Tab-separated table of C-alpha atoms in Angstrom:
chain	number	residue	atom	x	y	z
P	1	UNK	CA	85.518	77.963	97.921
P	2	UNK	CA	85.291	81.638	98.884
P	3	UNK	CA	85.937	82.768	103.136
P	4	UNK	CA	86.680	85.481	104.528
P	5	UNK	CA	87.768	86.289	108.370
P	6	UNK	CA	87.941	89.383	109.935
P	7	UNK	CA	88.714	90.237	113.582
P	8	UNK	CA	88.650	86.441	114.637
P	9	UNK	CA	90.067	87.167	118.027
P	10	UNK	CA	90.195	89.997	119.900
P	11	UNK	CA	91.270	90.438	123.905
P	12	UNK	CA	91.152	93.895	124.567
P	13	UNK	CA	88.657	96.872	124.536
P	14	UNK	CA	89.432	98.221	121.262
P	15	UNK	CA	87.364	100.897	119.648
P	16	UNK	CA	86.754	99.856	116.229
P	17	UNK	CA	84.398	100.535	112.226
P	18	UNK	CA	83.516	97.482	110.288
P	19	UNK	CA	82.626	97.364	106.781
P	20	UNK	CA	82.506	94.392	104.630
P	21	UNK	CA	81.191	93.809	101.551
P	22	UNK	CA	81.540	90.377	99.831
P	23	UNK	CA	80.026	89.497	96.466
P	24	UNK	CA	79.582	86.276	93.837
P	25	UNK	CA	78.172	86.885	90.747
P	26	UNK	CA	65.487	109.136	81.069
P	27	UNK	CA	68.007	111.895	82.739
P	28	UNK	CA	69.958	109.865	85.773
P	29	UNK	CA	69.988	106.368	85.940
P	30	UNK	CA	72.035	104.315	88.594
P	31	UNK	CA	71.699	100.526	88.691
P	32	UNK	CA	73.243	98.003	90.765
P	33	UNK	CA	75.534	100.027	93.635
P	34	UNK	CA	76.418	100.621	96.887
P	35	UNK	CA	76.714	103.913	97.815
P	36	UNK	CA	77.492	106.279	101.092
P	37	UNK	CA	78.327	103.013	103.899
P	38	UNK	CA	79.997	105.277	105.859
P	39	UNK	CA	79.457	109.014	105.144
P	40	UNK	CA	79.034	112.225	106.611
P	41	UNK	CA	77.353	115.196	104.643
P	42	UNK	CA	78.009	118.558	106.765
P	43	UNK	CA	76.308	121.910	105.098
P	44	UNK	CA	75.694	120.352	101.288
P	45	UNK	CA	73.811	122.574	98.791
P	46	UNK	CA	72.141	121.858	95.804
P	47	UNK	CA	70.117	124.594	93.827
P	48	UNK	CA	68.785	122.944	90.346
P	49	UNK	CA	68.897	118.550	89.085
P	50	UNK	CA	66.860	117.354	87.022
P	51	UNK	CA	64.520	120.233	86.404
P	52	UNK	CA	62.576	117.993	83.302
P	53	UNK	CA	62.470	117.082	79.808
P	54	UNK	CA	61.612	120.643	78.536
P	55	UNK	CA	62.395	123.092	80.794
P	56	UNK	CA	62.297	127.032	79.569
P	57	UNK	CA	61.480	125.907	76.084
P	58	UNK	CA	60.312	128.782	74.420
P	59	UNK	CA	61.253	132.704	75.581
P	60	UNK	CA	62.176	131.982	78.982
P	61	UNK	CA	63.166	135.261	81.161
P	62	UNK	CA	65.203	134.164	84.389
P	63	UNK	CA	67.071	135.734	86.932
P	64	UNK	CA	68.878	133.374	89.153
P	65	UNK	CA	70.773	134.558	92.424
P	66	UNK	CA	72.075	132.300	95.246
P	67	UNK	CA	73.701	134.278	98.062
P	68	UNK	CA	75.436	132.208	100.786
P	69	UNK	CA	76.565	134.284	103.864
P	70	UNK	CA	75.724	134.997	107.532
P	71	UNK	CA	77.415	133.306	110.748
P	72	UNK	CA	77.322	129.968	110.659
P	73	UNK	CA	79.777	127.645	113.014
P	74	UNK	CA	80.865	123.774	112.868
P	75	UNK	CA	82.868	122.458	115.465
P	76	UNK	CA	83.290	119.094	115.248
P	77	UNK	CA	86.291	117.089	117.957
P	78	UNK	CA	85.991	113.259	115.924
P	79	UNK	CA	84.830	112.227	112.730
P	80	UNK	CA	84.804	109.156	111.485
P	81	UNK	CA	87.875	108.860	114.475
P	82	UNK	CA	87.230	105.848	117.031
P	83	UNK	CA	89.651	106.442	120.283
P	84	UNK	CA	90.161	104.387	122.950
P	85	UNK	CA	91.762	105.260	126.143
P	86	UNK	CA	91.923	109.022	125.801
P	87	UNK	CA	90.398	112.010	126.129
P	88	UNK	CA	88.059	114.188	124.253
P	89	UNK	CA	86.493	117.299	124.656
P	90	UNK	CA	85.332	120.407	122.814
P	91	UNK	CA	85.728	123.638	125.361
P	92	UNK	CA	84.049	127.097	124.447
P	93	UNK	CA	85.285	129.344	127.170
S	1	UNK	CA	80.735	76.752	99.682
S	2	UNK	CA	80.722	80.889	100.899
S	3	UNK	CA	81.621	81.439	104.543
S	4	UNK	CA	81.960	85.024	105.855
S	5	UNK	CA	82.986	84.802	109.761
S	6	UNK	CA	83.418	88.361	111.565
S	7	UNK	CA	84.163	89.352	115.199
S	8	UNK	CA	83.956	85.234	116.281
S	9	UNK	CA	85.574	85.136	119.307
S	10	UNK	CA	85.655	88.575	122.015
S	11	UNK	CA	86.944	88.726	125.818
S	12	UNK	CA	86.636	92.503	126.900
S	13	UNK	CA	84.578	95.424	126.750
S	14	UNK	CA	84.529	97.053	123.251
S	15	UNK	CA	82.559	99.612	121.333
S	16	UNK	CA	82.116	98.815	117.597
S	17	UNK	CA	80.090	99.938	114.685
S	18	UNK	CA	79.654	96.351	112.184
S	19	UNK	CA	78.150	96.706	108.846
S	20	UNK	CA	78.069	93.230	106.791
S	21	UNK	CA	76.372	92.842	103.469
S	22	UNK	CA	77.103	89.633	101.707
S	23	UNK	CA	75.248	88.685	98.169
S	24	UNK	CA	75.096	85.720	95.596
S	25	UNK	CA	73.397	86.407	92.105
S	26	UNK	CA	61.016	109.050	83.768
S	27	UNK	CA	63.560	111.305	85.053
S	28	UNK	CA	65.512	109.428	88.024
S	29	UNK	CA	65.833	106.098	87.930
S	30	UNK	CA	67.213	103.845	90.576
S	31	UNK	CA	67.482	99.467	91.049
S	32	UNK	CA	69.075	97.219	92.803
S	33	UNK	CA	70.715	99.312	94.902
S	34	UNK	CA	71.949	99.633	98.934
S	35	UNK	CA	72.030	103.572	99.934
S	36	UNK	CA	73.193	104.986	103.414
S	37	UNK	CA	73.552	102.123	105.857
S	38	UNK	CA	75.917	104.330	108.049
S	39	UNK	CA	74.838	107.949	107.016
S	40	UNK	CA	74.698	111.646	108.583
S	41	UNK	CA	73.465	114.228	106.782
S	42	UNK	CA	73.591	117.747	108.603
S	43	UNK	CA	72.479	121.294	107.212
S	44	UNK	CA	71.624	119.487	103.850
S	45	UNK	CA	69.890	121.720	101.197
S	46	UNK	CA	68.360	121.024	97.982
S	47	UNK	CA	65.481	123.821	96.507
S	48	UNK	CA	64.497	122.592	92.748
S	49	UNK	CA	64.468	118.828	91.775
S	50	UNK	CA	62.723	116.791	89.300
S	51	UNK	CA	60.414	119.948	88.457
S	52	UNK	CA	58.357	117.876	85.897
S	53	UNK	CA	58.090	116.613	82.037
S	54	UNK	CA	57.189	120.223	80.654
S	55	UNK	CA	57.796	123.305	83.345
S	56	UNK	CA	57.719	126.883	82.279
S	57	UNK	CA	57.575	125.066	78.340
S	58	UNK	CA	56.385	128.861	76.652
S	59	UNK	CA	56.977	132.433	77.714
S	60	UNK	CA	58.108	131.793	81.712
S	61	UNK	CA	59.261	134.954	83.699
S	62	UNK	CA	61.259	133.692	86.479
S	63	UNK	CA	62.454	135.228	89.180
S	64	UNK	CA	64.895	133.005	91.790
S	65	UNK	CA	66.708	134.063	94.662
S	66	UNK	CA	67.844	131.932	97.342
S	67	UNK	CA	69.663	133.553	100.738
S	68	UNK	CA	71.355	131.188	103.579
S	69	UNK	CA	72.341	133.221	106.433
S	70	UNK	CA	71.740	133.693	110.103
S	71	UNK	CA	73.681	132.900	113.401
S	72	UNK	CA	73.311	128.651	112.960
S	73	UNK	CA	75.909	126.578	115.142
S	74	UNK	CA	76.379	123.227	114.864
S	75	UNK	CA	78.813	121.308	117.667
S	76	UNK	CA	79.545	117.812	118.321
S	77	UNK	CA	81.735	116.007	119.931
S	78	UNK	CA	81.826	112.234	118.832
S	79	UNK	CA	80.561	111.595	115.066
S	80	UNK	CA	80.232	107.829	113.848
S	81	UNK	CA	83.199	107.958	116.273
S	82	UNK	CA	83.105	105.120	118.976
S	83	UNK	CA	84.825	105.083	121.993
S	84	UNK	CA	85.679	102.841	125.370
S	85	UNK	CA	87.350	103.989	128.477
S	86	UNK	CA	87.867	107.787	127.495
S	87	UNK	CA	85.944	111.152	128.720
S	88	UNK	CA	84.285	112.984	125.980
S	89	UNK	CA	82.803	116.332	126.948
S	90	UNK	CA	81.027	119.302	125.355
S	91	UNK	CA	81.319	122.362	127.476
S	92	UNK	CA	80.216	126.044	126.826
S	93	UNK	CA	81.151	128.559	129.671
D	1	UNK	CA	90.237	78.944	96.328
D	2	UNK	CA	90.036	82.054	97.698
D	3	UNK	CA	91.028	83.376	101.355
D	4	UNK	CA	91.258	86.628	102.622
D	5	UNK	CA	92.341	87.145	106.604
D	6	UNK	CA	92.199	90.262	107.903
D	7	UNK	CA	93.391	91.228	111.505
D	8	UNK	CA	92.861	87.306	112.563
D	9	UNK	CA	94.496	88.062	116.428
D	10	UNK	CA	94.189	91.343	118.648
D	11	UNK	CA	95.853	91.578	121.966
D	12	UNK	CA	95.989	95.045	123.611
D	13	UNK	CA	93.541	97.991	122.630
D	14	UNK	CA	93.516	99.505	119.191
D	15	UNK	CA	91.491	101.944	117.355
D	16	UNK	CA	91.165	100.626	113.448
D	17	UNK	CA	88.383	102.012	110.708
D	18	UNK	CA	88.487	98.419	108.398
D	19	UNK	CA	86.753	97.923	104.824
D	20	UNK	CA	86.960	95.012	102.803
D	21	UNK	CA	85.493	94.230	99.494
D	22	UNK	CA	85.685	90.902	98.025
D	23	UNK	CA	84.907	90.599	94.576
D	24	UNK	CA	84.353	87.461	92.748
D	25	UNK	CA	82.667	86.715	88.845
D	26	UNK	CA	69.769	109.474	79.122
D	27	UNK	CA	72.583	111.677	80.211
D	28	UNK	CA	73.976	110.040	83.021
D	29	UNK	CA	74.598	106.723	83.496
D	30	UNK	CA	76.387	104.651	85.988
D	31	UNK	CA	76.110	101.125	86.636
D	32	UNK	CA	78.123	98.031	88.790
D	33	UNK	CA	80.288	100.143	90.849
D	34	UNK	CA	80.906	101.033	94.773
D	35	UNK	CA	80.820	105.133	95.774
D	36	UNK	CA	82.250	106.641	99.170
D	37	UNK	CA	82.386	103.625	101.560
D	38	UNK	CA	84.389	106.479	103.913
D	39	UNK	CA	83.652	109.756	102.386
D	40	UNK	CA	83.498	113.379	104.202
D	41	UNK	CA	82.013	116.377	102.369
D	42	UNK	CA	81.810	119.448	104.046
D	43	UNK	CA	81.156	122.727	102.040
D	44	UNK	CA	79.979	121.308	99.191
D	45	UNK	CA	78.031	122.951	96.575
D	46	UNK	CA	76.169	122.127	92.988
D	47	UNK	CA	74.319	124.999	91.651
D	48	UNK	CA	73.195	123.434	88.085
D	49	UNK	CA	73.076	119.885	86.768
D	50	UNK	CA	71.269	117.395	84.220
D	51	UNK	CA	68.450	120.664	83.615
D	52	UNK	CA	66.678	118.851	80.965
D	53	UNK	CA	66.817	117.347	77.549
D	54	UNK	CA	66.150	120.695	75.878
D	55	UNK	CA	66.319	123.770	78.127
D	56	UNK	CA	66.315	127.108	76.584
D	57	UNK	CA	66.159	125.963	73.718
D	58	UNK	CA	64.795	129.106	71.974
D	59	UNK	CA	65.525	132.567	72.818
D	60	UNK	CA	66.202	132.448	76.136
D	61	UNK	CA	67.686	134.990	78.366
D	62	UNK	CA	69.264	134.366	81.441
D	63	UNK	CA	71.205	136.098	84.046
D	64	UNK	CA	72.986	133.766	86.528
D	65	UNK	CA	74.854	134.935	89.582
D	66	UNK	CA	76.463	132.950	92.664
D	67	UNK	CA	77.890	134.507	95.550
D	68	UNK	CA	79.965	133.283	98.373
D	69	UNK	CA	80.411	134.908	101.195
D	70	UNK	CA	79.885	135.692	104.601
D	71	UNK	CA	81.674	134.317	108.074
D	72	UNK	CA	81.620	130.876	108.151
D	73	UNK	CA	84.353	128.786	110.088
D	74	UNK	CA	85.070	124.805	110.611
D	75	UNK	CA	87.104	123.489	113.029
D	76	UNK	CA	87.585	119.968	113.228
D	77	UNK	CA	89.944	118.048	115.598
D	78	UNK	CA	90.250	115.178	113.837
D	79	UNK	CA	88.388	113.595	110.699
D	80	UNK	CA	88.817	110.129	109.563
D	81	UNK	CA	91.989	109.759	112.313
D	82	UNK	CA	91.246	107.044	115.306
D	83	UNK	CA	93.127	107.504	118.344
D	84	UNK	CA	94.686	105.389	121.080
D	85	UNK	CA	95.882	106.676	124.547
D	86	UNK	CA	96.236	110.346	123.091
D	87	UNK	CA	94.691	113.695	124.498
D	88	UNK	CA	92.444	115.687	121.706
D	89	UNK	CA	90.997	118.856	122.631
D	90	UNK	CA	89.212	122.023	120.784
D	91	UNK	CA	89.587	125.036	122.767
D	92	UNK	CA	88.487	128.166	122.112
D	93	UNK	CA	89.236	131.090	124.362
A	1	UNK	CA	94.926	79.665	94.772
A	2	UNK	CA	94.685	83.043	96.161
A	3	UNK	CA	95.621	83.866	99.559
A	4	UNK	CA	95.412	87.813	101.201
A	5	UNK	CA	97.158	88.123	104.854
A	6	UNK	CA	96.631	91.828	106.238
A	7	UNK	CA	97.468	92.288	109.803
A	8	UNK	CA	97.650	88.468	111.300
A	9	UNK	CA	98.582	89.357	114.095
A	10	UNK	CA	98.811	92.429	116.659
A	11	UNK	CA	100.294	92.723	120.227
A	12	UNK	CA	100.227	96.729	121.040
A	13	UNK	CA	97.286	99.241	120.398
A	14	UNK	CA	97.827	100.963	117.358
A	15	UNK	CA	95.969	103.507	115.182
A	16	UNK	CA	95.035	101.839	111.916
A	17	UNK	CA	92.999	102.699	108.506
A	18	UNK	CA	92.749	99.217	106.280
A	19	UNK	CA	91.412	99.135	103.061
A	20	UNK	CA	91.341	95.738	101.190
A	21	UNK	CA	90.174	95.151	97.975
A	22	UNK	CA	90.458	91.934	96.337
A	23	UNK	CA	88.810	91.135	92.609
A	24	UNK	CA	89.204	87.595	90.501
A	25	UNK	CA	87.081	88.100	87.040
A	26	UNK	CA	74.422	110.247	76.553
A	27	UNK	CA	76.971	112.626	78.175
A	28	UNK	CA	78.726	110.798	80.909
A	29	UNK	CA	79.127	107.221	81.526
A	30	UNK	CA	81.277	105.080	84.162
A	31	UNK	CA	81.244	101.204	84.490
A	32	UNK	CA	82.513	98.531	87.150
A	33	UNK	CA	84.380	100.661	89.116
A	34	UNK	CA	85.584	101.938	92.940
A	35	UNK	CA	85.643	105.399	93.722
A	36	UNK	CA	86.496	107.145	96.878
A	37	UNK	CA	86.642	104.812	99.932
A	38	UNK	CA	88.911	107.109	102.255
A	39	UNK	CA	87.919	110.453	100.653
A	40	UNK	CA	87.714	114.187	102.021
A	41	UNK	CA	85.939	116.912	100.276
A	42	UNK	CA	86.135	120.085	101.874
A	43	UNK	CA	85.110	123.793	99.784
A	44	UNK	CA	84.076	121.828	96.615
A	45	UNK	CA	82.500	123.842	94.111
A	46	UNK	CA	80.931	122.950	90.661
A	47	UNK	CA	78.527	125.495	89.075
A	48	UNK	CA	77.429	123.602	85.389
A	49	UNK	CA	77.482	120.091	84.656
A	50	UNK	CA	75.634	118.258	82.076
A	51	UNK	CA	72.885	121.087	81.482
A	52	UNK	CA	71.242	118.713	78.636
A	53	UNK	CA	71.512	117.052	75.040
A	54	UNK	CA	70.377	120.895	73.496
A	55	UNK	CA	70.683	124.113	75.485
A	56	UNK	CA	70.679	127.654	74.418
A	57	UNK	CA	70.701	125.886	70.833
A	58	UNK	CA	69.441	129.347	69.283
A	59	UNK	CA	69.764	132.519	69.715
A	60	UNK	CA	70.522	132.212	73.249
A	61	UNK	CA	71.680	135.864	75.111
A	62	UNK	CA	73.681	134.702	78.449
A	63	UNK	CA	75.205	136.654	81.523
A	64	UNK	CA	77.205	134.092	83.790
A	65	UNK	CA	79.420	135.837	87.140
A	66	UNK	CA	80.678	133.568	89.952
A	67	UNK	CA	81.869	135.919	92.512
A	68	UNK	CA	83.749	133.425	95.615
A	69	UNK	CA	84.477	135.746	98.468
A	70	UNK	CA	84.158	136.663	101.919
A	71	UNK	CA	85.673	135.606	104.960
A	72	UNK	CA	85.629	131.209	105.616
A	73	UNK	CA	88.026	129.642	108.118
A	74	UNK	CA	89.038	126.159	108.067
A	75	UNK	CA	91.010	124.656	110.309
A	76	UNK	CA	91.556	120.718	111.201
A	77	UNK	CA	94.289	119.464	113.365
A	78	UNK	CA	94.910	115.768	111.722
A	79	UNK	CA	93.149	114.922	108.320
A	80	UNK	CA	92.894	111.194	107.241
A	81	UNK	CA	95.916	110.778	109.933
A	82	UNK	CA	95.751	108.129	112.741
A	83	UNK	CA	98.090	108.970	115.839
A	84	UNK	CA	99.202	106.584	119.026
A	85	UNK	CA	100.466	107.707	122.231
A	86	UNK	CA	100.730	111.544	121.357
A	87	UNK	CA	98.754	114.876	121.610
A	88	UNK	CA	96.741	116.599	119.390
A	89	UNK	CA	95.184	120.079	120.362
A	90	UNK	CA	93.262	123.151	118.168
A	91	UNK	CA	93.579	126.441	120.816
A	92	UNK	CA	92.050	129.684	119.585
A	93	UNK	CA	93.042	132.419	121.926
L	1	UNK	CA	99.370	80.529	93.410
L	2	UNK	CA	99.241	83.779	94.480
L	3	UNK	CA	100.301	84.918	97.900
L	4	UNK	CA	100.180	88.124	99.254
L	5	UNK	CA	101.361	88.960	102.967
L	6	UNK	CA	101.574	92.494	104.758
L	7	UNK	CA	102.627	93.368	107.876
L	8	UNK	CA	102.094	89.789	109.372
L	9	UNK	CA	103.132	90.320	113.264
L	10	UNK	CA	103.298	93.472	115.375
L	11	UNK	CA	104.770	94.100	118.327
L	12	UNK	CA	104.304	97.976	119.545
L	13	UNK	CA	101.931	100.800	119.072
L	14	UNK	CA	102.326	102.270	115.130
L	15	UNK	CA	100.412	104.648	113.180
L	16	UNK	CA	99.648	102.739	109.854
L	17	UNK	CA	97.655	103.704	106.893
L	18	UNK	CA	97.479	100.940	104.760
L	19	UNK	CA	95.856	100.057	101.359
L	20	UNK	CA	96.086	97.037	99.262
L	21	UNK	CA	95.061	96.181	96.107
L	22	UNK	CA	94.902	92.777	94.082
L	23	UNK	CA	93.801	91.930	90.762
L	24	UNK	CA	93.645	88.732	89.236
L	25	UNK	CA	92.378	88.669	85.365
L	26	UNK	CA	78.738	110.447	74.114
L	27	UNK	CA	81.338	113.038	75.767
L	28	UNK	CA	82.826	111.083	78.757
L	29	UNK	CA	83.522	107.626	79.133
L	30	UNK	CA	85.307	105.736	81.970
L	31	UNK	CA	85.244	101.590	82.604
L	32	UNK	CA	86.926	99.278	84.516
L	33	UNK	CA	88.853	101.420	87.290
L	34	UNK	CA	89.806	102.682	90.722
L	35	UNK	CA	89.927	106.418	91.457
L	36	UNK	CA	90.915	108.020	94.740
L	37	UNK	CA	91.501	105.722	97.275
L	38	UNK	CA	93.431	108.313	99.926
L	39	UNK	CA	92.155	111.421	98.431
L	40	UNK	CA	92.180	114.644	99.464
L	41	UNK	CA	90.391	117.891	97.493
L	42	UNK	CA	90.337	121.348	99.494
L	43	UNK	CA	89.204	124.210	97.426
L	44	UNK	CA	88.910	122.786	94.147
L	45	UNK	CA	86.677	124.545	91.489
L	46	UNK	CA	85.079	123.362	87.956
L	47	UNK	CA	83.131	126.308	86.106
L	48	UNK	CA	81.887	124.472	83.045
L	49	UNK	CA	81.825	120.799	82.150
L	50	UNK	CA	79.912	118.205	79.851
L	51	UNK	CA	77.760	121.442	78.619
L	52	UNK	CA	76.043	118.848	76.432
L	53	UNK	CA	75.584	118.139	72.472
L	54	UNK	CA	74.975	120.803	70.858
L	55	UNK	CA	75.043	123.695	73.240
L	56	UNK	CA	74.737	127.440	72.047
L	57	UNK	CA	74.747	126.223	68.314
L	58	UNK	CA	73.908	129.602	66.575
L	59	UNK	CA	73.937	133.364	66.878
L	60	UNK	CA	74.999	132.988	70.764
L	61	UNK	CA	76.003	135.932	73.067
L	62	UNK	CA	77.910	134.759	76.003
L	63	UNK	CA	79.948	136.421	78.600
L	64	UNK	CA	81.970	134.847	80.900
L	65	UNK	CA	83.211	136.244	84.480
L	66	UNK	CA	84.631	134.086	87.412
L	67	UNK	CA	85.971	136.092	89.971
L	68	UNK	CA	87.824	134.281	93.268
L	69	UNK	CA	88.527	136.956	95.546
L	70	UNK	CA	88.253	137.554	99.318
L	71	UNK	CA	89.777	136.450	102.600
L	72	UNK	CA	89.933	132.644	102.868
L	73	UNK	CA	92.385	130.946	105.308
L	74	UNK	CA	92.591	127.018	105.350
L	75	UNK	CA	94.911	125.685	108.095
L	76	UNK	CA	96.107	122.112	108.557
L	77	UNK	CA	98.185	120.662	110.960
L	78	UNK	CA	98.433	117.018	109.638
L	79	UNK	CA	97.427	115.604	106.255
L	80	UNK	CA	97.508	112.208	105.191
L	81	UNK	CA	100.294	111.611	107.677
L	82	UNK	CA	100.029	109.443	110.819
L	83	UNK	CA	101.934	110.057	114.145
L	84	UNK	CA	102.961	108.258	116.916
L	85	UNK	CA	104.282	109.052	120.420
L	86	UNK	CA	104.176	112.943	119.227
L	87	UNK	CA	102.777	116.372	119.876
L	88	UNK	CA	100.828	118.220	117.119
L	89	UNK	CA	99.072	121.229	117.727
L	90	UNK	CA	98.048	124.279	115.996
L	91	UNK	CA	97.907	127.675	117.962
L	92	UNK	CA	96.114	131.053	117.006
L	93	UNK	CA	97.519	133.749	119.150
């Protein structure tokens, strides 16, 4: 036998995140996952993966630069937060 | 037997997020897999990926340059967040 | 036998983030496993990975450079942090 | 027999994070594993990783600088921290 | 038998963060684990990792410069700790 009970009864207003998971049982390789249920990807960067087998083999002449800069704003009042019953706001006077 | 009971029994006014999985059993390479069922990707950069089997194989001249800038603003006020019987706001005077 | 009860009663109005997992039984390899079920990146940067089987492999030259910089600002309230009959606010005068 | 009780029974509204997690039984390589369910990655910075099975194998002439500068602001009022009954607040004046 | 019980009854309004665990029974190699269930990582760095086999074999001509400079502020109010009936803020005069 195999159960599992979650949040059989509830009575109020609640403010609530549910996950559940139950199980019986050439460069990147991934098999048989779970991955990112409940994620949040703010201002990710990724410059070079995976660029082949052979890449710049023979008398290769590079000149790599990446420049990250300027104004850039994140303004964030919950993440990921549930609330109930309060008060939330995000005020740019 | 498997039995997987969730949220049976509710009386008042809730807000809920519910995510249930339940299972009985060249280059990139992915199977069998479950990716992103609650996801948020913002300002999410990639520039070179999986460029081939053989790029710039003899005598490459290269020249990379990538520049993030700029006035960019980004505001939120309830991410993967829920909520019941609150005030959420977003105000910019 | 195998039971697993998780918040079987609720009577008033809470704010809960709930995960349950229930188990029962070339040049990067990963296999069977669960990644970031409640996962926050923010600023997050990769600049080379997995280039090849053979890059460069003869007489290469290469000038690399990565700069940082430049006015960037996050403000978070709060981030993986539920709530219940609170006040949360993000002013800026 | 294997019983798990989290949380039977609640009579208030509280602020909660569960996690429950119950198990009966070329270069990098991870097996059957968990990683990261309540995880926060903020300014996370990797520059080479697994760059292949053979680079710069001969007579390779290489320049690397990783210049981190500039002015970044971070600021977060309650980080992977649930609160009841109280008052959080970022002000900026 | 095996019997596990936490926090069975509650009566008021906490701030809990709660994590259970139960187990019944080339370069870089991991199997078989659990990594960073409350984790947090703010400004961490890795320059050079899992280069590969046989990386600048012969004759190479490398130099190295990693420079962290510049004016980077990270405030936190809270971290990894849960409040109840409380006041937390964080003020920039």
């Amino acid at each position: 036998p195999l159960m599992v009970k979650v949040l059989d009864a509830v009575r109020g207003s609640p403010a609530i995140n549910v996950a559940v998971h139950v199980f019986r049982k050439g460069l990147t390789t991934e098999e048989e996952f779970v991955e990112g249920i409940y994620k949040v990807e703010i201002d990710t960067k990724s410059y070079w993966k995976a660029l082949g087998i052979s890449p710049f083999h023979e008398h290769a002449e590079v000149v790599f630069t990446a420049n990250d800069s300027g104004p850039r704003r994140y303004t964030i009042a919950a993440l990921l937060s549930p609330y109930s019953y309060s008060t939330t706001a995000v005020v740019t006077n």
